[PDB]
Amino acid sequence: RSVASSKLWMLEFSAFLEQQQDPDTYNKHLFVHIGLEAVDIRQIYDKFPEKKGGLKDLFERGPSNAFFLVKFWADLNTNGSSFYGVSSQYESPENMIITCSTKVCSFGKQVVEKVETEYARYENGHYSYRIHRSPLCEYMINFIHKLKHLPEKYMMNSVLENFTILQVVTNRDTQETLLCIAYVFEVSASEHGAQHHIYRLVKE
């Protein structure tokens, strides 16, 4: 239970491109996947939205154990029949209605927000939530295409310095922050493919 507060645990997170070769054949490439050291949150505030409802506001409001930073090394090594998607799975001891807000940010400014509402399913004494094959927005699809058309890997990492994603999962009724996950990116060079480190965000 790495990405887990007192109330919610994200067990799975993956962003992928699925290509339909023929009616019975599908090829799926994972860009990033999840399936703890501390970072001073003040070091990253500039890469995320400010003001009320922004990362600092959310962090100050707490709980402190709900805040995480994920560093992804993304696997971009991949080629009418394309689906770009993201899937994630969560578990809670409580039956809540949750909302998941995903903000794509550039130079700390919100470019798009996706908002998803998820209801609980009973599962072995606890409750499960799944966001299954959420379509990647057009901005993200275009961003990936532009990144891949850059001549050099160092150029891709340069662009990625100022591209972030903020995920805020909230109890809809109470507005309690269940999980807040800040995502930062580099390109993978590894032979194993996509990698990640998960960090706890702390006040200092």
């Binding site: 050291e37 970072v39 001073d40 070091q43 500039d46 560093k71 090394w73 550039s106 130079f107 400014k109 901005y139 275009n142 961003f143 532009k146 850059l150 150029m155 340069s158 662009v159 310095e161 100022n162 591209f163 930062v184 580099e186 993978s188 060079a189 590894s190 990698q195 480190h197 960090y199």
Partner: protein
């Protein structure tokens, strides 16, 4: 004054002579754990 839009973002890296986006501290130069830049 700088621009913060999608073409400008990639333009700044592809054609640095015409770059007009905000300037920032590189992640490598910030107070971050060593593991941040060394993948497993």
């Amino acid at each position: 004054d700088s621009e913060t839009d999608l073409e400008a973002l990639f333009n700044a890296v592809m054609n640095p002579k015409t770059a007009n986006v905000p300037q920032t501290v590189p992640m490598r130069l910030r107070k971050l754990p060593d593991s941040f830049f060394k993948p497993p």
